[PDB]
C-alpha cells in the first residue's frame, strides 16, 4: 500500500495503475521561419498549339513497348555479329555516337552489346552534351535507342536522369517558333515516353 514493492511484478503492476491514472494523450497549448527544401522543376508546358493529343501520346507508348518487346527478343543474336568506348569515357562516347568522325548510328548490333550500367552512363553523357549543344536528329535517335534498351524496373537514379532529360526537352521547346520546326516532333516524343512509358506522369503534357 504505502510499503515499497518487493518484487518486480508488484512494481510493474504498481506502475500500470499509475499509468491509467495518467491521461493517455496530452496537448500543450503554446504561445508564439524554416529552411527551404528546393525541389526540381516540373516540365515546361508546351507553347499553345504545340501540345500533342493524348491519342497520339497513347499510340506512341503502345508502339514503343512493342519496339522494346522485339529489341529484347533479339538481343542475343545481335550480341554476336567500331571499338566501343570504355564505359566511363564520356568524351569518347560523345564523339562516338555523335562525332565532330561523324557518328555511329545506334544499330541493334551495337546497342545490344550494351550492358545496363553503360546504357545509363551513355544517356548521361548524351544528356550532358545536349544541355550544351543543339538537339539534332542524331541525338534523338540515340536517346530514343537507349531508352529502348533501358530495362524496368529502373533504378531511382536512372529515373532522375531521364527526368532531367525531359525537362530539358521542354525547355528547348520554348525556343521554337514554327510547328515545322524539326525538333518539335522529337522533343514531344521524348517527353511522352518518359512521361507515359516510364511512369513520371507529373512531367506529362496533359493538353488544354
Amino acid at each position: 500500500p504505502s510499503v515499497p514493492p518487493r518484487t518486480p511484478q508488484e512494481y510493474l503492476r504498481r506502475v500500470q495503475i499509475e499509468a491509467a491514472q495518467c491521461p493517455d494523450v496530452v496537448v500543450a497549448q503554446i504561445d508564439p521561419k524554416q529552411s527551404v527544401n528546393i525541389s526540381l522543376s516540373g516540365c515546361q508546358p508546351a507553347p499553345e498549339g504545340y501540345s500533342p493529343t493524348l491519342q497520339w501520346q497513347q499510340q506512341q507508348v503502345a508502339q514503343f513497348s512493342t519496339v522494346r518487346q522485339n529489341v529484347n527478343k533479339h538481343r542475343s543474336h545481335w550480341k554476336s555479329q567500331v571499338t566501343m568506348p570504355k564505359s566511363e569515357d564520356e568524351e569518347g562516347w560523345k564523339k562516338f555516337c555523335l562525332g565532330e568522325q561523324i557518328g555511329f548510328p545506334p544499330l541493334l548490333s551495337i546497342v545490344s552489346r550494351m550492358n545496363q550500367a553503360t546504357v545509363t552512363s551513355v544517356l548521361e553523357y548524351l544528356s550532358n552534351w545536349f544541355g550544351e549543344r543543339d538537339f539534332t536528329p542524331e541525338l534523338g535517335r540515340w536517346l530514343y535507342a537507349l531508352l529502348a534498351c533501358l530495362e524496368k524496373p529502373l533504378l531511382p537514379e536512372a529515373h532522375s536522369l531521364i527526368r532531367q532529360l525531359a525537362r530539358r526537352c521542354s525547355e528547348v521547346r520554348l525556343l521554337v517558333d514554327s510547328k515545322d520546326d524539326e525538333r518539335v516532333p522529337a522533343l514531344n516524343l521524348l517527353i511522352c515516353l518518359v512521361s507515359r512509358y516510364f511512369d513520371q506522369r507529373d512531367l506529362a503534357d496533359e493538353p488544354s
Binding site: 497520339w56 514503343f64 529489341v71 548510328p105 541493334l108 534523338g140 535517335r141 530514343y144 510547328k179 516524343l189
Partner: peptide, 18 residues
Amino acid sequence: DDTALIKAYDKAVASFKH
C-alpha cells in the same frame, strides 16, 4: 534490319501530325 531502331524512331517522329 540492323537499323530497325533508327527506322522505328523516324517512324515515330514522322507519326506526328498536328
